[PDB]
Paper text:
The [name] intein comprises 429 residues and is larger than the PhoVMA intein (376 residues) but similar to the size of PI-SceI (454 residues). To prevent self-cleavages during protein production, we expressed both inteins in E. coli with alanine substitutions of the catalytic cysteines 1 (Cys1). The HINT domain of the [name] intein also contains the β-strand extension found among thermophilic inteins. However, [name] intein probably carries a catalytically active HEN domain capable of binding to DNA and introducing DNA double-strand breaks. The ACD of [name] intein strongly resembles the helix-turn-helix motif common for many DNA binding proteins, such as transcriptional regulator proteins.
Inteins catalyze their removal from a host protein through protein splicing. The HINT domain catalyzes the protein splicing reaction, whereas HEN domains often function independently of the HINT domain. In this study, we elucidated crystal structures of HEN-associated archaeal inteins inserted at the same insertion site (VMA-b), which is located within the A subunit P-loop of the vascular-type ATP synthase (VMA) from [name] (Tli) and Pyrococcus horikoshii (Pho).
Residue numbers in the entry: -2 to 429
C-alpha cells in the first residue's frame, strides 16, 4: 500500500477534538471530490479541517486539505517506553532526531526500518488555544430555567474536573462525591456562579456528596460528553477543553488531580487511573497543552482493565506548579546530541561547562544526556533556542518493541503543508 496509519490512530483536530482517524474519515467521506486508484483513494476536502503540526520548533494548528484511505497487506506496530503504541503501514514515516552544532534536524525513518532502541519524535507541548464559545443550536436551544455558560473558562473547567473525577449524572441530579466538605462547598459556589442554581451537601455512609437537582443542568453536561459515573468505560475529553487556553486546561487538570490523582513518593509521580481508555488518551493530550509528557499503562484491578496516566518526574511536576525532588524517577527525556562535535565546534568551553556541573568526558562514550542537562549545556554552545523551543515541544521516545503484523486492513492518512501532523494514543509526530 501507501503511507498511512491504522484506523484507531487518534488525531487532534480543532473541529472535532481528539478523534480516531477512521471516525474522522467517516465524518468527512463524501465531503469533497474523491479520486480512486485501485486500493487507494484521496478526497480533496471541500472545507479543510485543522489539525496540529510541527514547524519552526513549535506545534500549532495547520490545515488538513485531503484525506486518504488505502488498503494495506500488512502493518508495523511500534511501542515506546512512554506507552505509545502506533500501528502504521511499513513505509509510513516517523521521525528521529539529532542535535548538532547546527541545531535539531528531524530525519524521516520508515516504520519497516525502525528498531528497538531508536528514539522517535513525540510531542510534549501543544501550543495554541482560545477561549471556546460553547456551541448552541441555531434552532431552539437555551434552557431558560438555568443560566447556561457561553464560554468555557477556568471556573467551568474546574467544575468539570470535579464532575469527571468524582461525580455522577442521574437523569435529574448532578452529584459530586468527596470527603473534603470545603471542596464540595467550592463546587457549590461554582454552580451558583456558573448556572445560577446550587445544591446541598448530603453526609452519606462512606462519603459526603454535593447534590444539584436540575434536569437542564444534567442535559448541559451530557451534551458536553460528561460520563454518568467514574466507571464509564467510554467517556472522552470534551473537544472544547482540548482547544482551550492552557490556563483553562490547568484548572481542569488540577481539579481532576485533587479529586482522583495520587502522588507516589517513591516513584515521584502523580498517577491517574481511569476506566476509560480514550479518556486516558485524551488526558495525555491535555497534559501536553501544559507542556507535560505523560506515560500510559494498562493495569489489572480486580479482574478488569484500567488505564493509568502518570505525570512523572521533577520537570513534569514543575509544570503543575509542584516543586519536588524525584530521585527515584528514571529519566526518559533524553536528547540525541552530538556532544563531542558540538564541544569542539564551540572551541572546547571546558571550564564553563565544569561551572555548570558538566564534565565533558562523561558524554564522549555514548552516554545519554537528559533534557535537563542539555538545557545547561545548550546555553554555553549557542543552542539555547533549540533547547527552549524545539526541545520544549519534542521528546525523543525510546522504541521498546517493533512487530510486523501480516494481516491486511484499511488504513488512513491526511495531507498537511508541514508534511506532519500530531496523532497517536499519546501525541506523536506522524509524517504525511
Amino acid at each position: 500500500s501507501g503511507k498511512a496509519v491504522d484506523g484507531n490512530t487518534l488525531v487532534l483536530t480543532e473541529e472535532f477534538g481528539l478523534v480516531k482517524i477512521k471516525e474522522l474519515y467517516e465524518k468527512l467521506d463524501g465531503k469533497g471530490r474523491k479520486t480512486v486508484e485501485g486500493n487507494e483513494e484521496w478526497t480533496e476536502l471541500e472545507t479543510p479541517v485543522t489539525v496540529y503540526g510541527y514547524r519552526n520548533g513549535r506545534i500549532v494548528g495547520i490545515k488538513a486539505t485531503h484525506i486518504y484511505k488505502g488498503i494495506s497487506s500488512g502493518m508495523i506496530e511500534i511501542r515506546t517506553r512512554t506507552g505509545r503504541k502506533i500501528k502504521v503501514t511499513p513505509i509510513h514515516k516517523l521521525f528521529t532526531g539529532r542535535v548538532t552544532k547546527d541545531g535539531l534536524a528531524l530525519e524521516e525513518v520508515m516504520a519497516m526500518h525502525i528498531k528497538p532502541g531508536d528514539r522517535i519524535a513525540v510531542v510534549k507541548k501543544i501550543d495554541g488555544g482560545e477561549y471556546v464559545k460553547l456551541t448552541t443550536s441555531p434552532d431552539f436551544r437555551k434552557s431558560r430555567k438555568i443560566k447556561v455558560p457561553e464560554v468555557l473558562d477556568e471556573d467551568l473547567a474546574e467544575f468539570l474536573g470535579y464532575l469527571i473525577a468524582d461525580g455522577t449524572l442521574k437523569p435529574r441530579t448532578v452529584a459530586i462525591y468527596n470527603n473534603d466538605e470545603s471542596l464540595l462547598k467550592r463546587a457549590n459556589f461554582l454552580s451558583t456562579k456558573l448556572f445560577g442554581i446550587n445544591g446541598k451537601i448530603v453526609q452519606e455512609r462512606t462519603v459526603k456528596a454535593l447534590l444539584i437537582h436540575s434536569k437542564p443542568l444534567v442535559d448541559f453536561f451530557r451534551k458536553l460528553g460528561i460520563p454518568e459515573s467514574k466507571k464509564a468505560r467510554n467517556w472522552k475529553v470534551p473537544r472544547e477543553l482540548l482547544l482551550s487556553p492552557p490556563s483553562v486546561v490547568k484548572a481542569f487538570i488540577n481539579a481532576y488531580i485533587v479529586c482522583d490523582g495520587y502522588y507516589h513518593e517513591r516513584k515521584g509521580e502523580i498517577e491517574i487511573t481511569t476506566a476509560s481508555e480514550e479518556g486516558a488518551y485524551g488526558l495525555s493530550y491535555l497534559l501536553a497543552k501544559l507542556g507535560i509528557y505523560a506515560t500510559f499503562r494498562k493495569k489489572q484491578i480486580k479482574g478488569k482493565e484500567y488505564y493509568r496516566i502518570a505525570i512523572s518526574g521533577k520537570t513534569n511536576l514543575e509544570k503543575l506548579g509542584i516543586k519536588r525532588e524525584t530521585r527515584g524517577y528514571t529519566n526518559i527525556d533524553i536528547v540525541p546530541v552530538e556532544v563531542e562535535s558540538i564541544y569542539n565546534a564551540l572551541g572546547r568551553p571546558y571550564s564553563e561547562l565544569k561551572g555548570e556541573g558538566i564534565e565533558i568526558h562523561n558524554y564522549l562514550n555514548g552516554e545519554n544526556m537528559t533534557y535537563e542537562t542539555f538545557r545547561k549545556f545548550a546555553k554555553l554552545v549557542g543552542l539555547e533556542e533549540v533547547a527552549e523551543n524545539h526541545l520544549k515541544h519534542i521528546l525523543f521516545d525510546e522504541v521498546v518493541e517493533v512487530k510486523y503484523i501480516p494481516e491486511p486492513q484499511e488504513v488512513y492518512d491526511i495531507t498537511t503543508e508541514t508534511h506532519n501532523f500530531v496523532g497517536g494514543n499519546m501525541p506523536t509526530l506522524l509524517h504525511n
